[PDB]
Scaffold this active site. Structure first.
Site, PDB file in Angstrom:
ATOM      1  CE1 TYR A   1      -3.475   1.860   2.675  1.00  0.00           C
ATOM      2  CE2 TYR A   1      -2.238   3.731   1.269  1.00  0.00           C
ATOM      3  CZ  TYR A   1      -3.190   3.904   2.194  1.00  0.00           C
ATOM      4  OH  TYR A   1      -4.364   4.654   2.148  1.00  0.00           O
TER       5      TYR A   1
ATOM      6  CB  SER B   1      -4.897   1.992  -4.782  1.00  0.00           C
ATOM      7  OG  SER B   1      -6.538   3.236  -4.538  1.00  0.00           O
ATOM      8  CE1 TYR B   2       2.053   6.019  -2.272  1.00  0.00           C
ATOM      9  CE2 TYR B   2       0.402   7.991  -2.303  1.00  0.00           C
ATOM     10  CZ  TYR B   2       1.326   7.070  -2.471  1.00  0.00           C
ATOM     11  OH  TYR B   2       2.468   7.924  -2.012  1.00  0.00           O
TER      12      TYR B   2
ATOM     13  CG  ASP C   1     -11.060   3.150 -10.940  1.00  0.00           C
ATOM     14  OD1 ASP C   1     -11.160   4.122 -10.564  1.00  0.00           O
ATOM     15  OD2 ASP C   1      -9.961   2.251 -10.683  1.00  0.00           O
TER      16      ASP C   1
ATOM     17  CG  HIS D   1     -10.198   2.655  -6.995  1.00  0.00           C
ATOM     18  ND1 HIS D   1      -9.547   2.335  -7.774  1.00  0.00           N
ATOM     19  CD2 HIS D   1     -10.069   2.363  -5.722  1.00  0.00           C
ATOM     20  CE1 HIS D   1      -8.174   2.548  -7.039  1.00  0.00           C
ATOM     21  NE2 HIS D   1      -8.957   2.845  -5.843  1.00  0.00           N
TER      22      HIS D   1
HETATM   23  C1  75N Z   1      -5.137   6.190  -4.882  1.00  0.00           C
HETATM   24  C2  75N Z   1      -5.711   5.765  -3.699  1.00  0.00           C
HETATM   25  C3  75N Z   1      -5.240   6.210  -2.763  1.00  0.00           C
HETATM   26  C4  75N Z   1      -4.816   6.316  -0.722  1.00  0.00           C
HETATM   27  N1  75N Z   1      -5.768   5.335  -0.247  1.00  0.00           N
HETATM   28  C5  75N Z   1      -6.741   5.587   0.801  1.00  0.00           C
HETATM   29  N2  75N Z   1      -7.129   6.796   0.350  1.00  0.00           N
HETATM   30  C6  75N Z   1      -7.982   7.428   1.307  1.00  0.00           C
HETATM   31  C7  75N Z   1      -9.487   7.389   1.678  1.00  0.00           C
HETATM   32  C8  75N Z   1     -10.099   8.148   0.853  1.00  0.00           C
HETATM   33  C9  75N Z   1      -9.108   7.900  -0.809  1.00  0.00           C
HETATM   34  N3  75N Z   1      -9.378   8.475  -2.097  1.00  0.00           N
HETATM   35  C10 75N Z   1      -7.342   7.675  -0.767  1.00  0.00           C
HETATM   36  N4  75N Z   1      -7.313   5.273   1.701  1.00  0.00           N
HETATM   37  C11 75N Z   1      -6.653   4.278   0.838  1.00  0.00           C
HETATM   38  C12 75N Z   1      -5.661   3.862  -0.098  1.00  0.00           C
HETATM   39  C13 75N Z   1      -4.662   2.977  -0.818  1.00  0.00           C
HETATM   40  O1  75N Z   1      -4.540   3.270  -1.502  1.00  0.00           O
HETATM   41  N5  75N Z   1      -5.365   1.860   0.043  1.00  0.00           N
HETATM   42  C14 75N Z   1      -4.202   0.566  -1.430  1.00  0.00           C
HETATM   43  C15 75N Z   1      -6.101  -0.451  -1.021  1.00  0.00           C
HETATM   44  N6  75N Z   1      -5.447  -1.727  -1.483  1.00  0.00           N
HETATM   45  C16 75N Z   1      -6.318  -2.842  -1.752  1.00  0.00           C
HETATM   46  C17 75N Z   1      -6.202  -4.041  -1.879  1.00  0.00           C
HETATM   47  C18 75N Z   1      -7.301  -1.858  -2.506  1.00  0.00           C
HETATM   48  C19 75N Z   1      -8.376  -2.673  -3.205  1.00  0.00           C
HETATM   49  C20 75N Z   1      -9.751  -2.576  -3.790  1.00  0.00           C
HETATM   50  C21 75N Z   1      -9.588  -0.837  -3.749  1.00  0.00           C
HETATM   51  C22 75N Z   1      -8.961  -0.389  -3.183  1.00  0.00           C
HETATM   52  C23 75N Z   1      -7.685  -0.712  -2.449  1.00  0.00           C
HETATM   53  N7  75N Z   1      -6.953   0.089  -1.982  1.00  0.00           N
HETATM   54  C24 75N Z   1      -5.707   1.554   0.755  1.00  0.00           C
HETATM   55  N8  75N Z   1      -5.994   0.526   1.467  1.00  0.00           N
HETATM   56  C25 75N Z   1      -7.116   0.609   2.978  1.00  0.00           C
HETATM   57  C26 75N Z   1      -7.303   1.921   2.634  1.00  0.00           C
HETATM   58  N9  75N Z   1      -6.490   2.687   1.580  1.00  0.00           N
END
Ligand code: 75N
Ligand code: 75N
Ligand SMILES: *[C@@H]1O[C@H](CO)[C@@H](O[C@@H]2O[C@H](CO)[C@@H](O)[C@H](O)[C@H]2NC(C)=O)[C@H](O)[C@H]1NC(C)=O
Ligand SMILES: *[C@@H]1O[C@H](CO)[C@@H](O[C@@H]2O[C@H](CO)[C@@H](O)[C@H](O)[C@H]2NC(C)=O)[C@H](O)[C@H]1NC(C)=O
Ligand SMILES: *[C@@H]1O[C@H](CO)[C@@H](O[C@@H]2O[C@H](CO)[C@@H](O)[C@H](O)[C@H]2NC(C)=O)[C@H](O)[C@H]1NC(C)=O
Ligand SMILES: *[C@@H]1O[C@H](CO)[C@@H](O[C@@H]2O[C@H](CO)[C@@H](O)[C@H](O)[C@H]2NC(C)=O)[C@H](O)[C@H]1NC(C)=O
Ligand SMILES: *[C@@H]1O[C@H](CO)[C@@H](O[C@@H]2O[C@H](CO)[C@@H](O)[C@H](O)[C@H]2NC(C)=O)[C@H](O)[C@H]1NC(C)=O
Ligand SMILES: *[C@@H]1O[C@H](CO)[C@@H](O[C@@H]2O[C@H](CO)[C@@H](O)[C@H](O)[C@H]2NC(C)=O)[C@H](O)[C@H]1NC(C)=O
Ligand SMILES: *[C@@H]1O[C@H](CO)[C@@H](O[C@@H]2O[C@H](CO)[C@@H](O)[C@H](O)[C@H]2NC(C)=O)[C@H](O)[C@H]1NC(C)=O
Ligand code: NAG
Ligand code: NAG
Ligand code: NAG
Ligand code: NAG
Ligand code: NAG
Ligand code: NA
Lengths: 728, 728
Positions: free
Chosen positions: B509, B592-593, B670, B702
């Site tokens: 992440y 995502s990130y 997305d 997404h």
């Molecule tokens: C582009 C950016 C960013 C950053 N981001 C944020 N932010 C804060 C909330 C609002 C959002 N717009 C930005 N919360 C995050 C991330 C992030 O990238 N991940 C990784 C991640 N992993 C997996 C397997 C995922 C599987 C499915 C969908 C998303 C996933 N995402 C993550 N995991 C748990 C929380 N979050």
């Protein structure tokens, strides 16, 4: 040991075919480019002079994309700022260069963002389209006369085609036609007001923060079509009247009853024009022959000069009704039409008599009428040796139809079995272009005696290079299915041994009027697969294929995705029966219609194929354009052919893909076969839990033709085929 | 021998974690859904009664998505026709059922396509948003009072958030805040007039002939943002004859000088509201404390009651300025803020005093404030055993800050090191939810003497099932980089042998405030990879990671795609030197990130990684939303941080992918990380001649979360990792 023809050889164009592209400027001279210089050649003697030195435009400030010399040789139209649109369309900036004054025209310039430009056929008038309206310049340095005021972006097109007319009807962006001596300018007007838009994202350069949405009026099968009107303006009246009238020529009542198309425009004389109209149900076409009436200033089309062309078994023409070729006086014409036996032959018509006379006949077809003189008609046909995949030039004596000479058949029968031709302005000379089975050969001939003047390009440089390469061979033959000959070709690995079992790749098009079995020499992906990878690359012309008569071509009428699909499966079974094919290593691939056929085959549950690749495939006929789709399918309505439109989708076969390895590829900016088509295939495969391989090409269109994407796609496909065939 | 935890086990949810989701309705009772019946439990004794029988709505005629019982227990809101929008937003139809008269209310129904609905916190008033306007119902059977008349699709949002506020600010669609006893209804209004639209194709079912273009007001980095206004309406003085008067609360002058956001709304008392505002340059925030003036009917925010929160090293708050927790009289509050050492601790504020007093301190952080009484403040922190990846509940005596008691630390130290909590209305009881390292454990407690009343759910059924499975283990430890400890976790295959070399997959992440190394028990894709495929699945929290103070968190301020990328490479380099890791088989993946970091790592030229997978990656910060991106990056302007925005793209590293196997995956619909981001990566790779694997997911967003796409993606990724690691 000699090297093989590698993937890098194909991708880097290491072994280059030389061409001989000339541009006839009169009955005895042609232009040819040698080391960026434009040379003028005397056809009779072969001697040349520098028409325009390669240094002339060094300080122009722009890279010149193309040029066009005015028919009178007084001016040159310089094309730059070339921005490609669809298959034929593009926009550009233009400058005119005065050849006598040896100076560029700086006053009353052709505007930037001009859509189309053409010289008159005699002299140096210009007609151009800018912001969807027509303009005419009598003199290059003088103000333009505006012809139309209705032009409107994506709505009203004057003198240029909309998307579907460009792609499917005229195979051209231009919708203007100068009369023979340039007095009249005829043009079409398309109205796309109610035509729905295809919309897709265009990403552009990385610097573009928000993707652009491209929106194009595009009628999918059964949707609202563009409407069309036809006009003729007297350009000689422009400098005398404030606003010269464009006289409309209306479509006949038999067309006005419903949706229709304007499908051909051919000038017969200075004061006679022929128009062909086609009903939206494309098995009925009407030709009107219209005369200028000097007293009323109108154009009248006598019903006694109206010609009907219909089909009871299919559609009209190969892809559209054929063009007429008028005798000098405009009182009679020649036209390729399907005879009583379903073979396309030359019919001779009197303008005011409804029954025509066939001048050619036989179980073979005329491909095209190339030239017409007071004494002879010249045409290309596949008559020679009864080979539908061969092409030769013939000359028929108009005063005696029994006198038919084959002009190219015996020139070099081992090397040359596929010809095209380019005649000089009044057919005094002709250039023959042999494209196979041997290396392409370009020759010049005099029509007065049919003698060979000289060899223009023989590809001896390439022949020398190829001597050091283990090149594949090509077999062209036929198989007999249900007492009908069906032709096939095989690209065979070097040192081909019939006692060995080779992996086989079936290379598919298989669309109506397709021909994948021919005598053309090609250096392509198949060359590499056979030469380096020892894969046999086979193609087969089954039911629906062209140039063999209507019994074969119309076999798939109203039934796309049926016999032409089944025949590819049967072809692979027949190739297995030949004994030199490894039955565990049969693959299939194709692009566009070939991608639809490949996908239909991979989803058939036949068990014949291990894997396959579909590039930019059609997946459902309702997604493709109206003009092409409806020609073979009719309308997607319960009263017409909806049940078959619904039964012939790739998506309905998704479960059968569990049996194969599939690679699906599509360009995101494909304006022709929309990315939607592959997006629906992938979603249907995901829905039934079928694993497959995918590749999108950002901002690539139907051709996936940019230098980098072309190399990327062929590299990706080569890895996939090699993995399928367990090749290191 | 016993089975392993397979890919089918993960995809088909064979091994299910049991939950105990309750809803507190008072200080002594909670609702619990059991066998589609709704039960009410007494917390003291654990006895229950049926509140709502599962059969009550057997004749309803619609499938009920969710229920919401009014705070007084007199009515039940029935949610149906649920249509998802973004992460939190959706529309639905609603029916109200009277629980006393046992009847559905048929009069003055909540309309279809309702965007948001909420009961008042006390009694049974309703506030709902429909067509972007706010409505209030005093009684469920009575006509609604229209509060706002300005609502306009994609332009004016009253009481609901626009895309960016939903996703990045409030983590909710709701922009309505009832006062504690329901007298007042506070709301925000967003204005997206000048906000640019992201546009993308949506294909829909195969029956849709033309793809639809979805258009969403979405501000990318540096683009025009939505503007915001805040209002408060008195719901006790509404009239059927007169339009409701909304009193505006304007942002302070320090915010009005430029672009800003409303980032928190928290009611303090019946007549006092607090608001936090954040500058678009997110290192400066202001809290206003506003009192109702009975005499003027106005809301006044005294300058003496303003509280400034700023950061000199980074942005304010973990993702936004934290929420205040007001005392009963509203004259003081507790709020988590970063202390002078950069650690987030609880500060105690007086409403009219600038200086706050920290009540907690140390090299650990308070995660959240959970409950507050006159005697104690309850909070979650990672203090215990100095493990930043562990969480426990503590209470602090408000009259003596030296008296801090851990309430969950010692309950079951071997099984439970990560807790969350749910307190009853006045904190008389609390439910503890242990989520690892052992199986989740739900327990109920009384606050007076912290008695452990009962075990609600102990997952003993799952424990029994898992005894017959070769389950992987988890190692949580740390490495030392520049005298700083950075934590990692490894999912280790069953029967782990330190003498054997295992392939390793780095699961990433690594975004700001991320934490991937923790004590949580998970059954996921990594469980299968370790259990069945014998792959070690590692995760590492390097620079930019959360819950360890600002020196670590703010290390990536204005510099995304730098230290957090380098630190993932460094951790794998360190893992590659461990005796149990095969240095020839190290892979990386993230979504995502995590997809951005994976891609940045794969393009680094480190040579540590053989292969990797990016799912829905960010590829260039200018493509991502303003609120999240700018928080870390500032503005993409030459005067601010444009150079770093331009230097941190995946596209610039394309040539470095020549030495890795890369799989790029993205959903076409997305709305969050636009498909454009991956479309630009693929185009950059094609442009440098780098082969890679791709997969698009038609119409997935997404989450790629539809049942079939979820199974398909994990299936496709599993084949890719297995091929990379030479696993049959
Ligand atoms: C582009 C950016 C960013 C950053 N981001 C944020 N932010 C804060 C909330 C609002 C959002 N717009 C930005 N919360 C995050 C991330 C992030 O990238 N991940 C990784 C991640 N992993 C997996 C397997 C995922 C599987 C499915 C969908 C998303 C996933 N995402 C993550 N995991 C748990 C929380 N979050
Ligand atoms: C969907 C449909 C159809 C049918 N179609 C037509 N029609 C007539 C003209 C207007 C067009 N809209 C429809 N001309 C066709 C086809 C067709 O599918 N192929 C196969 C094919 N193969 C390869 C390797 C290609 C490689 C690059 C780009 C296109 C390719 N296309 C084909 N090859 C040569 C000619 N053409
Ligand atoms: C090709 O050669 C012929 C013969 O040399 C050129 O014909 C012209 O012949 C006259 C003699 O009456 C010479 O004075 C000229 O040099 C020629 N005329 C022109 C207009 O050039 C002929 O032009 C040559 N063609 C090319 C393209 O070089
Ligand atoms: C293009 O076709 C459209 C109809 O599709 C014509 O638009 C109509 O024009 C009439 C005036 O004669 C109006 O009364 C209607 O309201 C219009 N209909 C629609 C659907 O827009 C339009 O006039 C045609 N344009 C040309 C230049 O022929
Ligand atoms: C040239 O003549 C055409 C044909 O009459 C004029 O076009 C008409 O223009 C007006 C509006 O200004 C409308 O009454 C008609 O619907 C138009 N018809 C067509 C076919 O376009 C045109 O405007 C004239 N140009 C000048 C400069 O007078
Ligand atoms: C090209 O053809 C047009 C049409 O025949 C010629 O224009 C006619 O010329 C004749 C005299 O021969 C007159 O009877 C008519 O008034 C003209 N008609 C029109 C419609 O303009 C024209 O002269 C020819 N042009 C050239 C340069 O030969
Ligand atoms: C919600 O939508 C439904 C369906 O469109 C509406 O319910 C009745 O539904 C029937 C058909 O299912 C229609 O004939 C009527 O127009 C509807 N009228 C009434 C009075 O129930 C319904 O009205 C919508 N609900 C609200 C609160 O507007
Ligand atoms: C909720 O709080 C509101 C605001 O404090 C209360 O409304 C006030 O009540 C007293 C009556 O005891 C009046 O003197 C004020 O004029 C009211 N203020 C406003 C702003 O309306 C109310 O008592 C509480 N409501 C409930 C239902 O408990
Ligand atoms: C908020 O962050 C901004 C951006 O880092 C800080 O801005 C200053 O202004 C620019 C940056 O765009 C530079 O010219 C200066 O170096 C910064 N000023 C300094 C360091 O004094 C801004 O100071 C920050 N605000 C707080 C309260 O720390
Ligand atoms: C085309 O555009 C350029 C610059 O935008 C301008 O200098 C030039 O005059 C234009 N040409 C014509 C023919 O309008
Ligand atoms: C044109 O095709 C339609 C559909 O097959 C048919 O009903 C009609 O009779 C056809 N016309 C001719 C001349 O066969
Ligand atoms: C639980 O038991 C008490 C008496 O011991 C009773 O008064 C109460 O109503 C019961 N609560 C529920 C929710 O059944
Ligand atoms: C929304 O903002 C625009 C400026 O972008 C302004 O013209 C308009 O009045 C605003 N609408 C409301 C309801 O505030
Ligand atoms: C309330 O406001 C709306 C919009 O301004 C208006 O059209 C309506 O007539 C008003 N009703 C009363 C009672 O003033
Ligand atoms: Na107990």
């Amino acid at each position: 040991t000699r090297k093989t023809y590698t993937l890098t050889d194909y991708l880097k164009n290491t072994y280059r075919l030389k061409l001989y592209s000339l541009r006839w400027i009169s009955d005895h001279e042609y232009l040819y480019k040698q080391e960026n210089n434009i040379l003028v050649f005397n056809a009779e003697y072969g001697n040349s002079s520098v028409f325009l030195e390669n240094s002339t435009f060094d300080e122009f400030g722009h890279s010149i994309n193309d040029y066009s010399i005015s028919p009178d040789g007084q001016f040159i139209l310089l094309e730059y700022n070339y921005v490609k649109q669809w298959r034929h369309s593009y926009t550009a900036s233009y400058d005119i260069y005065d050849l006598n004054k040896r100076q560029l025209i700086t006053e009353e310039r052709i505007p930037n963002n001009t859509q189309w430009v053409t010289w008159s056929p005699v002299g140096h008038k210009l007609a151009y389209v800018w912001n969807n309206d027509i303009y005419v310049k009598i003199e290059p340095n003088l103000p333009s006369y505006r012809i139309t005021w209705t032009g409107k972006e994506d709505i009203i097109y004057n003198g240029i085609t909309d998307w579907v007319y460009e792609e499917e009807v005229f195979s051209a962006y231009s919708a203007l036609w100068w009369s023979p001596n340039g007095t009249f300018l005829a043009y079409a007007q398309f109205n796309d007001t109610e035509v729905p838009l295809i919309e897709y994202s265009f990403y552009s350069d990385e610097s573009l923060q928000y993707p652009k949405t491209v929106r194009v009026p595009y009628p999918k099968a059964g949707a609202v079509n563009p409407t069309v009107k036809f006009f003729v303006v007297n350009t000689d009246s422009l400098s005398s009247v404030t606003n010269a009238t464009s006289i409309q020529i209306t479509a006949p009542a038999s067309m006005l009853i419903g949706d229709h198309y304007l499908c051909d425009v051919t000038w017969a004389t200075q004061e006679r024009i022929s128009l062909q109209w086609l009903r939206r149900i494309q098995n009925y076409s009407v030709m009107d022959i219209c005369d200028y009436d000097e007293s009323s200033g109108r154009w009248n089309c006598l019903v006694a000069r109206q010609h009907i062309e219909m089909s009871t078994t299919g559609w009209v023409g190969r892809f559209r009704p054929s063009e007429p070729h008028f005798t000098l006086d405009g009182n009679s014409f020649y036209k390729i039409i399907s005879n009583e036996e379903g073979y396309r032959h030359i019919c001779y018509f009197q303008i005011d008599k409804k029954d025509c006379t066939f001048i050619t006949k036989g179980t073979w077809e005329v491909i095209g009428i190339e030239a017409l003189t007071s004494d002879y008609l010249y045409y290309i046909s596949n008559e020679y040796k009864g080979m539908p995949g061969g092409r030769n030039l013939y000359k028929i004596q108009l005063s005696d139809y029994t006198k038919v000479t084959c002009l190219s058949c015996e020139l070099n029968p081992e090397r040359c079995q596929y010809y095209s031709v380019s005649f000089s302005k009044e057919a005094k000379y002709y250039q023959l272009r042999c494209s196979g089975p041997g290396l392409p050969l370009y020759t010049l001939h005099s029509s007065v005696n049919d003698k060979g003047l000289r060899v223009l390009e023989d590809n001896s440089a390439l022949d020398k290079m190829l001597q050091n390469v283990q090149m594949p061979s090509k077999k062209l033959d036929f198989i007999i299915l249900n007492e009908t000959k069906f032709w096939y070709q095989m690209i065979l690995p070097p040192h081909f041994d019939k006692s060995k079992k080779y992996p086989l790749l079936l290379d598919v098009y298989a669309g109506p009027c397709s021909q994948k079995a021919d005598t053309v020499f090609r250096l392509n992906w198949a060359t590499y697969l056979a030469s380096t990878e020892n894969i046999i690359v086979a193609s087969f012309d089954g039911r629906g294929s062209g140039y063999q008569g209507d019994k074969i071509m119309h076999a798939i009428n109203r039934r796309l995705g049926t016999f032409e699909v089944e025949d590819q499966i049967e072809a692979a079974r027949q190739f297995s029966k030949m004994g030199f094919v490894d039955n565990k290593r049969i693959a299939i691939w194709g692009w566009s219609y070939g991608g639809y056929v490949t996908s239909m085959v991979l989803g058939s549950g036949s068990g014949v194929f291990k894997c396959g690749i579909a590039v930019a495939p059609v997946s459902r006929w309702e997604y493709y354009d109206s003009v092409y789709t409806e020609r073979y399918m009719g309308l997607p309505t319960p009263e017409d052919n909806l049940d078959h439109y619904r039964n012939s989708t790739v998506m309905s076969r998704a479960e059968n893909f569990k049996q194969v390895e599939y690679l699906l590829i599509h360009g995101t900016a494909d304006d022709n076969v929309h990315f939607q088509q592959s997006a629906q295939i992938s979603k249907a495969l995901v829905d039934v839990g079928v694993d497959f391989q995918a590749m999108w090409y950002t901002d690539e269109d139907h051709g996936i033709a940019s230098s980098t994407a072309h190399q990327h796609i062929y590299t990706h496909m080569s890895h996939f085929i090699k993995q399928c065939f367990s090749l290191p």
